[PDB]
Amino acid sequence: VRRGHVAPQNTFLDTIIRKFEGQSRKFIIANARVENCAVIYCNDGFCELCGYSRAEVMQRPCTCDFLHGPRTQRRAAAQIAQALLGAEERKVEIAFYRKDGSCFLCLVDVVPVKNEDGAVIMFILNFEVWTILHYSPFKAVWDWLILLLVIYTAVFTPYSAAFLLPLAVVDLIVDIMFIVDILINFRTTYVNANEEVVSHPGRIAVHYFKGWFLIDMVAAIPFDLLIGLLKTARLLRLVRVARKLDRYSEYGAAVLFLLMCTFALIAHWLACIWYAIGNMEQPIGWLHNLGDQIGKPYGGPSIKDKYVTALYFTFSSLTSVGFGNVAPNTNSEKIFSICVMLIGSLMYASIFGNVSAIIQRLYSGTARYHTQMLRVREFIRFHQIPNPLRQRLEEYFQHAWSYTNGIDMNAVLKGFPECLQADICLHLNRSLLQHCKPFRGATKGCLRALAMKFKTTHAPPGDTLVHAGDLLTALYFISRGSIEILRGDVVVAILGKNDIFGEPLNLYARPGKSNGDVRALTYCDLHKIHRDDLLEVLDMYPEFSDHFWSSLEITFNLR
Amino acid sequence: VRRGHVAPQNTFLDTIIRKFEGQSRKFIIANARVENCAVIYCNDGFCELCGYSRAEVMQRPCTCDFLHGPRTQRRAAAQIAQALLGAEERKVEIAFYRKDGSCFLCLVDVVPVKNEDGAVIMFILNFEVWTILHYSPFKAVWDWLILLLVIYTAVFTPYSAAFLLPLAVVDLIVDIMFIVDILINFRTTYVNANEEVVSHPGRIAVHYFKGWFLIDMVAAIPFDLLIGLLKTARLLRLVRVARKLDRYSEYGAAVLFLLMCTFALIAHWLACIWYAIGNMEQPIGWLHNLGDQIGKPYGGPSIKDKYVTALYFTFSSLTSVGFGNVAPNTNSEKIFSICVMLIGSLMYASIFGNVSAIIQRLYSGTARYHTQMLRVREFIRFHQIPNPLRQRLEEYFQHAWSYTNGIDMNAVLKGFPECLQADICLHLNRSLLQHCKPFRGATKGCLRALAMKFKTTHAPPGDTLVHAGDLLTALYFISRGSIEILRGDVVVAILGKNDIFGEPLNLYARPGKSNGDVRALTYCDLHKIHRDDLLEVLDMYPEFSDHFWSSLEITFNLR
Amino acid sequence: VRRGHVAPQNTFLDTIIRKFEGQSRKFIIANARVENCAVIYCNDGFCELCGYSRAEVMQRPCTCDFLHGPRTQRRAAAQIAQALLGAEERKVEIAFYRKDGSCFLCLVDVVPVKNEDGAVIMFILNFEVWTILHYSPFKAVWDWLILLLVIYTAVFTPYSAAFLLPLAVVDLIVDIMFIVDILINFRTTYVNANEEVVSHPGRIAVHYFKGWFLIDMVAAIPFDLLIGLLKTARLLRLVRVARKLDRYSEYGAAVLFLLMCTFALIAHWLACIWYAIGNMEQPIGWLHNLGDQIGKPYGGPSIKDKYVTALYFTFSSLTSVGFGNVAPNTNSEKIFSICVMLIGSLMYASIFGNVSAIIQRLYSGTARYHTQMLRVREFIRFHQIPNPLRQRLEEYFQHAWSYTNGIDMNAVLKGFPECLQADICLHLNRSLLQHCKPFRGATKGCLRALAMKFKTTHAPPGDTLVHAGDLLTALYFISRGSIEILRGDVVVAILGKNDIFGEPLNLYARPGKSNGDVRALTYCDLHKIHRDDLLEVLDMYPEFSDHFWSSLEITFNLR
């Protein structure tokens, strides 16, 4: 469900610039909180007045010592400052001098802007010469509740329309729910593309007109005043689902349930319409043909049969089975079967084309699993892989897929920019950065740059990562599990959690050799970088890099 | 719709070289507009005559001082030049000397070529020893109009063919439209693969013969002279759509409408042919079997029934529903049902195989949207992403897809060459290059090279792009929206439109640190490059690079 | 089939650390096998006691000379060591001194741990102040045997349920097999996600309860005590296949056989249920309608017909053919046909959507073969390729695909890490590394790094690999086949197996030119590297690189 992000606390600055832009005004803006109260924005009108650019005027106190000149008096120079100290609408009565130097009869409309907090936040100087949400647990399940009673009305009113020429009271309860639905739509919030959120009743009622109220206003019209064709407006209650279509695509099985249940309603109406053709042609047809299948000539036949036989027909016709217990004969009867065969051939390709995809889309992980498995089984038979390695290929692949759900890690990150990519890896690698000792005395830029180059490698039982004689390119960190260290089949050491191993990069200044082996016991969790990846970041932060190597204590210097 | 590009104004030079190549001539060509009227092309015959190459002879005045020698007279050296000053066909009577040096009895056929402008454009020296278009608003909608009356004739003439053994006058109006169609095809333009456009009536009439006129000439033959089989030629009017097939693939819903409506015509003919089998076998069949369904024995049955029942059958047969209200019995009746089942099984796979794809191809953006969404929802459940970041992933992804329609930006550019790739990015980034100050005094090569390395990054509300302590690799430009600047949660500055921020690259000559943060308010539009990307271009243009840094005024030097 | 890897011999160390972690203990661990019996792990409690880190304490004898001080006595310093020499639970009664230096009343609980071997393996010092497998040839084929008798019961009990109101003895044999199935499930092993394997009867019986025994316990209940609805519990024997679903996805044709045979069982039950509707409505229906098709009014009709006609109906209904020899009429009859058409339209899309994919997934190699072939045949017609090269394109492509099965070599390796990637290439290139002379005196790290950069190139008959004048970038090795050497169409030399050719990299220290050509006779097998790829590895191992070039004898130095 789409819900737009709330407006930041400084968004009122955009509207004030937009307001005074509408007046064709000439002005500047200066903050109160900062040291000497410097300028924060100036419009193009102010640039034309003096001649200076935005860059030159910015980061300067709003007393503005450059605006002084020969003709600028000494007495009211104070009458610039004591307005920053006093706060009031007062036109300060003085000339100024431009960049190149020129006299002009200007006048400083000094203003202090004040917000809901009741404090002096921003200065501006013009020149002249009961509430309800839309993503709440109340509103969430109530859309499914609306959808149920829509399906109730959409089905049971065709039953009333065709056949009727406990139930009387319960149908009136559903009519009141739609009247309650309209009143609730006023106070609830909505999301404009630009205006991410908008609230309170001065603004919501305008959007509701000229949208989808004119259609829904017809739904809530049950007049009393024969002739049941007046109740055809209750079918337009179905439009409430069409407008809220994005809500009903959350779960995998829920989308299947809608396309399966709506398939019944398509048949249900056609069943009721098929029956209507039998009633409104009495001069031999299909109903008297049914009257011979079940011995009831004319008296009359059964109501329960007439609805079933019609539904049976329109299912048999639209499903493209085509029995012929019941089938058309007269002109209008065949015309219907042409319509049902034509829409049926369209529907049976359209609706079950999607449902055939939805089952494979629901079981999408296990679909690609077997294709990836057939690559491995072909790769085994192609190369002839023996048993000691056979186990390692299967168990790693089954551990890799079962853990990650066969999802590409970096393929998702490519779409996002580098700022939010770092924030994603910061969330995954929170267990190292926040908890460990050397990363605490560090700025936020250092954390993100490091977070990019980290790699969360997983190690199942008995996996030899690095061996004796190899080049220690990486420098590892152990988050969870329990990792061993061996050499010549003797247990040298064990490491649990929050531990480090590799080499320092200051002493050698070279690619150093390894000392011994390293193997996992449990399904251990660890992290990884490189020598080249680390140094390129650490050299950018020289004052941080001294703190890094001193505080960081590695459990094994491996030579 | 394919329409070839018009021939440039200097394409007549190709035909003149091609003309004098046909004579086995030996010649050169020289321009009038250029300073001293130098040579612009020479054929291989001239290279063989003297011995010099194209490179050596080119960029030399057509007086040709190298062609002089001992035997070349002084009096008629003027009689080379005053032809460039006088203009006439005159064989200049003199010898010349080759590269190595040799006498040969040559003769300069001096010519001034003149075009429609009526001016001296090009010199050549031979040696010896009511209109109509095809992509107009008139022709565009008239193809759809032709297609309608084709469908009118294609349907209503089978009705006349089978059943007939207001309407009399209106059918004759359609016959005249095809006669009008033929006359219009003469004056209209066409597109040869080589000849991009060709016009005026000397050349178009030759292509129309031996193309698709011989078939369309049969369409316009309504002779008066019984026997309605003479009107079978009106079915060949359907070929006018087959030739113009590329026109009817513009809209998404329009292709669906053709394949859906032609499906009816396939049934329509088979319905009329099914009826013809009933009439032309009278010795029990299907028509007398229908005469018992609706009580009409022989007198005769109804015409409206006979057409419907046949259409109902051929739909039921070809749609693969198979009712059996009406069905074959005699030899010829079954032979038809074998033909309809065989084509029906072929058609129901072929035509609705495409229509099943067309609905997913029409909703192709929203199809891949849900697959990309399932990657994110799996990625959320796989990593367990909390609420403050949960919003950022959804809102960025929904903003990114809704803005770009889920289209790859650079994937389209890869097919095109670097010249037109730069022209595409020049169109997108026109708002910076043409309007801003420093890019005005610049050549066209500088604009294209820069345009390649620009990146149009979009920033929704409250998006922190760069933070304090980070390395300012990029140098941004603000086109639209409104962007803030903060540090330690205090509003430092605001920027509107056509503004700049980053660092100068001359003072440091290093990767400098950042000063503070930067965040968006509105759905702001901005651009981006790199330090390495800029300098590699700027160093190629040293005289431009001095103008660049001086005129370019950045609003924030961020240290 | 998933089978987890067995626990290594040092996994009991994890449980001992986990045990003493549960006591809130403070301790260290030291090995017996290593030289001076140094420390191998210490918990965080020991780090807090003294103050030292893991890195500082590790790789130190467990006598611990740093733990001595002024107050540590000289007499019981021996009573640290002689426990390593004697072995017993004894609290060594002495103080110690921390990092900064401090007295504390501590007490060393000296322990020697001993395993099944009966030897002194590890020291610990606490401080205070009939069998059966599940992947055997017996169990493997017995799952297929269980599946057969499940299908026997699942089919033949509906036959007994509906119709019955040699066979008597044989059905009781199947009832005993399920009782045998339960007893076998106790002693057989299983695989927990964490616990890769678990055995012996103290631990297996707990998992079997609260899993899939409560359902299977109902299956083995054949009580004696009319009313055959008691045998409906035998349908729940079908659940034994649902739990063991991963077993039945091995072969390509085996998955097709299950989905094809289960399709019959879906019809089989519906056939038996369709028949039940005929029996249990006797007040005209479908059974008396059948009694007129085959002249048998009431007496009674045939049993063999009643089962076939029902099966014929439910096939005709669910397959979506829809004949109408037998078809519904009464209320309950149509309700069934609505249910069969609804599930039939769902099943015919779901089950045959997979089976349509399974045939193309079985013939998946030959599917992409023709698409790759159409690229080549288009590429031939697009460029117009003559006969001498035409043969080389076809024969290489047909040799490449037929050998490799159209599988990507490196695309499979990308998922695996660099350790196991090297192990895969070590298996493929075993014929060179183990057998040849220069690679014998080499460490394991040298073998893996080389193995990565090797490339198994195949050469069919008459393939010119390298020519005279070319740069010998690669350095080849001949494993199998027979390779020639030529220059100016004269036979210079021949090479068989385990041979080398290229250039030495020490003498030139440059990219040297080639001498002559090289061509294959048989379908030869060979390997390949590069000059840059080799030197980058060899420079890391300087002591190995001297042994490499001396022992390695190349058959042709080619200049």
Swiss-Prot record, chains A, B, C:
UniProt modification remark: Phosphorylated on serine and threonine residues. Phosphorylation by PKA inhibits ion conduction.
Variant or mutagenesis effect after changing residue 52 to H: In LQT2; uncertain significance
Outcome after substituting residue 445 to V: In LQT2; uncertain significance
Phenotype for residue 533 to Y: In LQT2; uncertain significance
Domain PAC, residue spans: 90-129
Effect caused by changing residue 325 to Q: Abolishes cell surface expression; has no effect on N-glycosylation
Transmembrane segments: 136-156, 166-186, 211-225, 227-247, 254-274, 335-355
Outcome of mutating residue 188 to N: In LQT2; uncertain significance
cNMP-binding domain: region residues: 438-538
Residue numbers on the Cytoplasmic membrane side: 187-210, 248-253
Consequence recorded when altering residue 252 to A: Slows the activation rate
Domain PAS: 39-68
Consequence recorded when altering residue 264 to E: In LQT2; uncertain significance
Domain statement: The S4-S5 linker acts as a signal integrator where it both couples voltage-sensor domain (VSD) movement to pore opening and closure, as well as providing a binding site for other domains that regulate activation and/or deactivation of the channel.
Protein name: Voltage-gated inwardly rectifying potassium channel KCNH2
Organism in which the protein naturally occurs: Homo sapiens (Human)
Parent-protein start and end of this portion: 3 to 863 of 1159
